[model samples]
Every structure is written in C-alpha cells, then in structure tokens.
Target: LKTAVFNAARDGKLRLLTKLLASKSKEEVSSLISEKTNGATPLLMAARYGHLDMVEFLLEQCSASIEVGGSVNFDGETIEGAPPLWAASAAGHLKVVQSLLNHGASVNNTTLTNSTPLRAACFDGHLEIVKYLVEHKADLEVSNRHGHTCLMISCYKGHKEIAQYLLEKGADVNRKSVKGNTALHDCAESGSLDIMKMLLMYCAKMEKDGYGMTPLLSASVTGHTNIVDFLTHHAQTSKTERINALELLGATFVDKKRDLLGALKYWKKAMNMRYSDRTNIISKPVPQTLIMAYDYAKEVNSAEELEGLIADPDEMRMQALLIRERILGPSHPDTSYYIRYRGAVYADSGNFKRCINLWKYALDMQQSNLDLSFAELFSLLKELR
Candidate 1:
C-alpha cells in the first residue's frame, strides 16, 4: 500500500491515488504504509519535491494528515523531525503550505529537530509563504538550527521584501544571531542597499558586531561604494555636524604631490581660524600650529622642513609628551607608548645611537610601570631590531 501510494505521489497519479484510497478500508489506507524501497510515504515525497497538486490530493482525498509528524520512510533515517508542512515550506510549495495550514496544522509546530515551517520558508526565501505563516501566527522570533531568526535569514539571503515585511510585523531589527550579527549586519554583508537604507530609516542602529565592525566598515571592506558613501556622508553630516576637515585635506594629498595651499585651507577651516591681519601671519598655539605644519610637511614629503620644524630628538620627544599629556592623561599607557614610538621615529631618521638610547629609556619606563605585557615588549623589541 505504501509502495502504491509513494509511486502514485511520485508520478503525480492523483486519480490512481483517489481510486486506491476509495477501494482500501480506512484502517488499511492509514496503516502507516512505508514504500518498499525508499521508505518515503506519499505525503513526504510530494511535500519534499513541491508536488503541490499531489499533496493537495493526498490531504483532501486520502486524508494524509500533516499532523502525523513522523518520517514516512526509512530511506535514510527518515526526517521524522518536521512534518509535511516543513517539507512543503522547504520546497517553497505555497499551496501545500496553505492546505496543511487549513487542515489544522500547527502554526508553531516544530520538528523533532526544532525546525519550524516558518524557518524553512525563511531559509528558502519564500516570501509569500513566510507571510502566510506569519499571518497564521507562526513564531517569527523562533531561531533555527543555527540560532538564526527569520529576519536574519531574510537579510542574509537579501530577501528585501521579506526583511521589510518582517520589520513591519514587529520583528526585532536589533536581534542578534549566535555570531552577534544583527539583521543590519547581514544586510550590509549581502550588499542590500535598499534594505540597509530602510533599516536605517526605521531606526536600526548601526551597532558594532562581535568583530567591532559596524555596517559602514563592512560596506567599506566589501567596496559597496554606494552604501559606503551613504553611511560615510550620513555619519559625517549628522553626528559630527560637519565633514572632517582633516579628511578633506588628506584627500588632496592622496594621489598628487602635497599642496600647501590646500593643506592650509583645511587646517584653517578645522581650527576655525583665519590668517592674522598683521603681516598675514597665523598665530595659532604651538601644538595646533605644529599639527598643521606636520601634516603639510608629510603631505609634500618635505623631510628637510620636518627636520627643521622639530630640530632635535629632544624636541620631538617634548612635542609627543605635550600632546600625550594634553589629550591623554600622563599615566595613560598609550601616552607612554607614543613617547616610545616618537623616540623610535626620531631614530628612523639616521639617528641610530639616539634611537637605541631613547628605546632603552622607554623600555625601562615600561618595565617600571608594567605598562605592557612581555608579548608587547617582545614585539616592540622586534620592530626596533
């Protein structure tokens, strides 16, 4: 009987199934028939391959119960986990799903493996099927085997409408997967600019993932130029209230030789100061002036001017110390680390003896304060060597 049913389902012999069901007694027909060879039941084979017509016939004519929730066959450890609804959803058989749902199939029914029909629909990108399941009160927040929600799967698959619909249905946009990636992260990775824009519009915060990378970083790495531009400009204009003047100036020197006039323009803008009225001088404080001078010299590759600006290793050390003290506290590990870094920079400019001496002093300070671990000290020593 199972063989006949399986073959009838596989070959789409709906009339044959109807005739056979009518002839057989109800107990005989529902005797849990398993195919002789593959062990798949009529419902399993039809549902698995998206045979919606066959599934509908079996459910309506033969009374194949979707709630029977067990593997029909022993073919390969029967997927008794999820019932026909899961199979139908996996194969994107919308009619089969509808029939199952109408026949009192559990909307929140989970397989032995905890796989739900909604999750199956999400995995297969069946947007309408998902909508139907959601409408039937399927659990949208239920995670799959991978701990991924329907929203995450939709975003990961770039199912824009599904993601939007899920969001509209009150799905948690900020919900994170096992990897700590939100729906926004998945959208960014999938390069779905429309979905990303929509999420942003709906207040999807660009939260950092486990790797400490935001959506902008993901877009930048993937070279999603439009997304990158949108995020960059949006952040610059909205949060900072203006474009970063330093970044603007750096752009001018990116490909061409340094332009002092360009550098000065951005520096003045950044500081919100203009040239002095007396003698056309710019009388900013020492550090700010030094910052501008350093940027200008580095942009133009004017090593000679840079040397004159600082004049000596001690002068460079003093500048680093001042900057560190002002920006970071004096006891900050980064401040001490920069002091050592500046010493090394000075040494790089043909002052080997000076470099070694300064590094020795920095190392002593580091050891005295236990500022860095042995691994960090070893790495620093390797660089110096």
Candidate 2:
C-alpha cells in the first residue's frame, strides 16, 4: 500500500492512486499520510511537485489526511511541519488549492510561525495564486510572526511585481514595524525606488517613525543617492515637509554628493523654514546621524509626514497599543514594550494611580511567557508610594 501510494503520488498517476484506493479497505487509506521518502508524506510529495491530479485523487478517493504536514528532505535540508496544503500553496498549484478548499480545507490554517497559504503564494510571486487567494477573501493584511506582511517582504526583497499585486489588493502602505518604519523606510534600505513610487502614488506619504525622521533621511544614511534624489523631487504638500525636504537634501549632499559648502548653503535656507509659533528647537535632542553627516558625511531619518504622534501623547499611546495588538498581540514582548511606554507617558503626565496600574499590567503580560521577573516596575514606581 505504501509503495503503491508513493509511486502513484510521485509520478502524478491519478488513475493508479484511484485503483489502489478502490482496492484498500476504507480505514486503511489513512496510511497515505505515511512518509514514503525524503520526510514527505504521499500527499506532500504530490503537491510539492505540482501534481494537482494526484493530490485530488489522494484527497477525494483515498481520503488522505488534509491536515497532515510534512517537509521535503533534499541534501540534508528541510522546511519542516508543513501540511499538504502548505506544499500545494508554496508550489502555486491552483487546482490543488481549489480542490482542498472545496473539500472543507480551512483557508486560514497556519502553523507555529503562522505561514498562511496566501503567504506561501506571495513567497513565490505567483500572480495566479495571488489572484485566487485574494478572490477567496484571504486576509491580505495579515503579517507573519516576524511582523512582515506579504507587501513589506516584497519591498525588502525588491519584488516589484508582488508589491504591485499586493498594493492593488489594498495592502496598507503606511503600515509600520514595531519600531515604527513604513514600507518606504524598507525601500530606503532596499534601495528600490521602483516600489517607492508605487507606494507614493497610492497616497503613502513618508511619515515620521519613532525616531522622528524621513525616508530621505534613511536613504542618506544608507547612501542610496537615487532614492535621496527621488524623494527630494517628489511633491511636498505641507510647509513642515518642505522644511524636511531641504534638510535631508542638504544632508544627502553633505554625506553622499561630497559638496560641503554647497550643502551648507541649503542647510542655512532650511533653518528659515522653522515653525512660526516656535521660539527654538535648540532644546530638542539633535539627531546624532545628522551631526555625523555634518562632521563625517554619514547619517539616518525615516520620519516625515507623521501622524504627529509625539506631539499628541494620547494618539501615540493608543497608536502603539493598537499596533502591538494588531501585529504582535497583547502579551508579546513588543506589546509589553508599548504598554510600558504608555505607562511612562502616564507617569510623566502626573497620573500616578493609572501609571502604576499600566506598569504592573505590562509586566504581568510580559512575565506570563517568560521565566523572568519584573523588578524594574517597582524600582520605577517606588517614589509614588
């Protein structure tokens, strides 16, 4: 039975599998889940190689386990704990995906790393797979355990085609990592302005990250001159952004273009663009990257077009909490980081009682998963007592 199932699934001989299934007793067919070779189940073998016909025959006629997961072994390497659907999805087997869905396969079934079939489809840049997954109402916004969504990963790897597909399907361009970087920030590091324009066209204005900087700033830090130039010339809709543009352009010139006094001329003009209501930003911590750029011609600012979070404590607090809950869930280490930040905000604003509660709550969430302690919570709050 194992040999027959293995050979038939391996060869995509659907008729051979059907005949074998007809010969076997009903309960005996479940052995189809057994590994034939290379750590693969009979079904996994068929799906991994794009054998849509054999996949259906195994599932429909032989009643092979739909939830069975197996990884292929090739030269001592393996992608472990993946179900047959995982294999089929990764291979871009459209017919197999349809058959599994029709047979009551869950679209959202995921393993420890939460690799959905949709992500699998995205991983390979299969347009038809992307279309089918999107058509079936797959959660296009869902990110992986690493906090990378299909679109962000696409940008990181310079996969413009997949990024195009994801943007067309309503992927969030403004979405940030836990560190508060947008897709444009990712592109700055990746140096892929080809994807950057697509994001900007979709209304992804570069925004202030947690550090308070611009994508141009990041490009400057990374020496991506093309991106610095690209961002410098794009339309700026506000006075603040225009100010940011000139500053980063000056930094770009200082750090990359090696025109020191020429860049200085631009910086002098930028200071004149400061807020009408301000006395001086001299009290603000001067960003080290710009200082480095000034002295040594090297720098970073992934902030622009911000939601203005730092100015509005409530919004920053709630925004952090919402992002934590969305990408990392409530009890994650990164979530605890946001909660703790919110607690500090409260303590600073003189809400002693609320501050204590938030601090304790953050520690509690963190300690639930860690074999660790929260002594710092008391150290910070003892004065209130």
Candidate 3:
C-alpha cells in the first residue's frame, strides 16, 4: 500500500494516492505519507517530477516533511541529498518551488557537495526558479565543494541572462574556486565571450589559477579562438603573455584540433609579435638542450624558419609536441597524451623504435606526475606487440 502511495506521488496519480490512504487512521496516514522509496519520500518525488497538485495534496493534507532530502536523477546523473525545493528548482518547476517555499521549505538547503538550490537552479539556467530562490533568501555566496559559486556556474554554462542577474544581485564577480580560477577563468575555458565581457566590466581580475594559467592562457589551452583573441589584446595582459598564449594556441590547434594550417597561422602571429619593435619585449631564447623525441628540432626563432614548417609534416608534428611540452609544462596531461598519441601513429606506420622511444618519454613524465599501474604498462606493451 505504501509502495502504491509512492508510485501515485511519482506518477501524479491522485486517485490512486487517495485510494491508498482511504480509511487509514491519522497516525497511519502520517507514517504512510512519510514512507520513502529510493531514499525519497512521496513529497520529494512529486516535487522532483514537477507534480504541483500532488505536491500540494501531500504537503497540505498529508503534512509531508518539506525539509527531508533524497536521491534524485537529473540529466542522467544522480544527485543525492537533494531536498524537494532543490529538486524542483533544478528541474525548473517554478510553481512547485513557490509551493515548497510557501510551505516553509528551507531556502538555503544544500546538497552533500554544499551546492544550494540557487546553485542548482543556476546549473540548469532556470531563471525564474533562480529568482524565486533568491527572493526567498537563498545564499548567493554558497559554492559547491569545489567552491564554484552560482555566478561561476552560470558563466561557465553560458547562461548570459542568469549570469547578468547574479552579477546585478552582487554575486562576487572575482570569486575564485578552490583551484584559484575566477569567473573570468571559467568564462575563458567555456568560451563565454559575452559573459567574459560582463565579468570584466564588473572589475573581474585577469588572474591565474592553481596551474599558474591566467584567463588568456586558459583560453588558449581550451582552443577557444574568440576568448584567446579577446583576452590577448586586453590592457591587462603583458607582451610576454600574448606571445605565449598565441604559441600555445597554435600547438593546441596542431595536436588537439588537428588543424595544421591553423597552427601555422597562430605560430606565425606569435613570430611577428616576437620580432615586432613596437615594444622592447624579448622572446625566450632557444633551448640549449636538444630533445631527442623531436629529432633535435629546435623551436623556430625567426619568421622565415616558422613559415618553412609548412613544407615538413613530420617536423610540424614535432613542433606541436615540443611547444605543448614547453608551454604546458611536464605536469600537464596533454603533454604526455600527445606524445603517446604521436608515438602510436608512428607504430601504426611500422616504426616501432620511434613509438617505444616516445612512449618511454611519456611514461617517464607520467611517473613523475602521477602513478601508472603495472596493468596499464603491460596493456600498452601488449598493444605494441
């Protein structure tokens, strides 16, 4: 019978719920309404699925607890510890949210990750529900366990209107996550040019993350040309930052995006800037030590040498690998990933020695950065065989 009640609440079968509760004592009815299926009470289920009438009937007649949390699924991801208000808000059920708030559901209730209903609404770009939650005193400053605020998620998710609303409501535009990435950094990585512009207007700083990458650098790494282009000429960036970002973006184009011509274009841009006399900015000196993996190919130090990369495909690939390793540093996973990938391509072409050498270098890098288990090592070796 309780299963029937839970089912009725979930499917909005009011007649069935009434039938299940018919002729029950007051105490029995109360306990039955409070019964849970999958850690969710009937009220939670109703709210989660946006069953407004069922939510009202349970809350008003059955006196279902408004604050009880339970597991709920959204976008194929299960979120545990979500209250009815949080579920409804995230689901964009403004009426259900209003009903829950009217029935005294806590406004600032958080999930296990410390994500509030405001943050949940922001995640899915529910503007009305976000407004309702904010009007009901939802905390704007509450971040998830990673310290990503409502504003940060909105900016990252490209919810321009929601981001604007949050910004107007005084959400911290310059707030950093646990990794020290600000909303501007999130905007750059996500390619949210409009939101980035808005953030800069709010005095959001062009700062670095825990990876020592600024928004310009993050934009280049993500291969977002619009963000990279916009941030490159911003008054906040130094000449050295512009050159590095352009070069890194070129490397990303070659390896990550598979655009050799695009890579050449950006590299050429970087080369012109390096040699330009408009400013006294000095390009980094060519490395004294040669890398065997690149066949001792040094980085192109002049415009003509950079242009000649078009004639040699293999050397262009090596340039991409070398630039990625240098700019992203050894700790970056992309450096090792591209090295392994290039090595695999060589293996497919009947060049086992090159593959082994490249893989060994990647494995060495991985060993220094993180653990590579015996299983992975053996599987890679088996693939080579």
Question: TM-scores of the models, in the given order?
Answer: 0.56, 0.56, 0.93
Clashing pairs counted in every model = 2, 10, 0
Worst 10 residues of 2 by lDDT: 291-300
Candidate 2 structure quality by residue, lDDT tens digits, 1-385? 4876786687788777777777777676776546556566787787777887667766764554677666653334466667766667777788888877787776776544566777777766676776787788788777666556667766766778888988988888888765566778778767899998888889887776655546776665455766865765576535555455455455445434545554544444445555334664311123323211012222122233232323543432343244233333444444565456656666898976666776776766676755413466461110100
Model 3 TM-score (2 dp): 0.93
lDDT of every predicted structure (CA atoms):
0.58, 0.61, 0.83
Superposed Cα deviation of residue 246, candidate 2 (Å) = 11
Q: Residue 314 in candidate 2 has what lDDT?
A: 46
Residue 174 local lDDT, model 1: 79
- Superposed model 1: Cα runs more than 4 Å off: 32-39, 60-65, 68-80, 111-113, 236-385
* Candidate number achieving the greatest lDDT relative to the actual structure: 3
Which candidate leads the pack in TM-score? Answer: 3
Ordering by lDDT: 3, 2, 1
Ranked candidates (TM-score, high to low): 3, 2, 1
- Comparing 1 with 2 on TM-score, the higher-scoring candidate is 2
Q: Is candidate 1 or candidate 3 better by TM-score?
A: 3
Clashing pairs in 1: 39-73, 71-80
